[PDB]
Structures are given as C-alpha cells and as structure tokens.
Design a protein around this ligand. Sequence first.
Ligand SMILES: CCCCCCCCCC[N+](C)(C)[O-]
Ligand SMILES: CCCCCCCCCC
Ligand SMILES: CCCCCCCC
Lengths: 49, 48, 48, 48
Amino acid sequence: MPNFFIDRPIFAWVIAIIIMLAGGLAILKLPVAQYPTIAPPAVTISASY
Amino acid sequence: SVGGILRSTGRYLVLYLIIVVGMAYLFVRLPSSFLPDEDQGVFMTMVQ
Amino acid sequence: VLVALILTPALCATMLKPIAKGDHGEGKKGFFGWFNRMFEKSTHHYTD
Amino acid sequence: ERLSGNQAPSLYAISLIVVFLCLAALYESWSIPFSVMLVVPLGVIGAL
Ligand SMILES: CCCCCCCCCC[N+](C)(C)[O-]
Ligand SMILES: CCCCCCCCCC
Ligand SMILES: CCCCCCCC
C-alpha cells in the first residue's frame, strides 16, 4: 500500500481531502453540549390526597 | 467531421459557453414543485 | 496509521528536500545549528 | 416550508467536487478530470 501511493501522490491527497470534506460537513450538522447523556434516566409518580 | 472540429477548437469553446448560459437560463426560468398530482381513480367533493 | 501508510509516504517522496550523506544539521546557522549539535552530542551520551 | 427546505444546490456542489476528486485519483491528474467534468452541462441542457 505505501509503494502504491508513493507513485500515486494525487490519489493519496484525494483520500485525505474526501475524509476532510466529510469531516467539515459533519461539524455543521453535529449537535453541541457540555456532556452527552451520562445521567441515568428517572421516572416520577406524582399523587395527591 | 471530428478531425475538422479539432482544427477549429476555439470556435466550439464559444458555442459551449452559450450552452452553459442557455442551461443557466432554462434552470432559473423553470418553476419548482415537490410531487405532481396523480390520478388515483378516486377523488372527493366538498359540500359546505 | 492510514494517513501514515497512504499520505505521509507520498509527501515524503515529493515534498522532502534531499539530505546529503553524513549531514545531521550540525553545520546549520543560528539556534537550529546549536540544538542539532546539542542533540547529536546528547545522543552519544545516551548510547554510551 | 419555513424551517429548512432548499438544500439541493449545496448537495449538487458537493456531488461535482467529490466526482472531480474521484476522477483525479483514477487518472492521477488535477487537470485531466476537467475533460469529463465539462460534459455535465451537455446532459443537463437536454433535461431542462
Ligand atoms: C487542501 C488541498 C491541497 C492539495 C495541494 C497539493 C499539491 C501541492 C504539491 C504536493 N504534492 C502533490 C507534490 O505532494
Ligand atoms: C493543485 C490542485 C489542487 C487540489 C484541489 C483540491 C480540491 C478542494 C475541494 C474542496
Ligand atoms: C538523552 C539523555 C542523555 C543523558 C544520559 C545520561 C548520562 C549520565
């Protein structure tokens, strides 16, 4: 694989550029927060007498 | 015929740019919808 | 590892400037000249 | 209609960019791909 891309430097760039482009487009859509869902979920039953 | 086109070259590059402008015009001109209305062998009549 | 097997070798074969046999940047001028002599000397200390 | 909708122009831009990059890998050239990419408007004109 190294000897393949040593002779084919433009191919090597294409793979890198496509990965970078995919990454760039991902940053636009990706949500932003402090933490992910780390808190375990809770259910509360509320009753009144 | 192709042999004669390559002797000109620059002539047909100007014709290409007119096709690109022609393409650009039709695209801008063409109205846009989502999905066409289909005949489903059924319809309804509203009475108010 | 994929970048190091695909891109890095391609760049090394095209972008890297040829280094002459025996040259370890000891003859460079300024700070880099001093650092290279320091490191080459520090390597001899370490290996010993 | 209000929130989001017209995202086609950006996807067509990305499509042609990725096709150019893939053509560049196939031919091992930044220039040769254009010979293929310049055919696109000759097809789009007919559709319009
Ligand atoms: C962000 C894309 C920039 C890619 C430009 C690469 C061409 C410069 C020459 C590098 N080379 C192909 C010889 O390794
Ligand atoms: C010298 C060739 C330049 C490489 C083209 C990079 C394409 C950018 C895609 C966003
Ligand atoms: C890079 C380490 C050099 C020091 C070696 C220790 C010699 C006593």
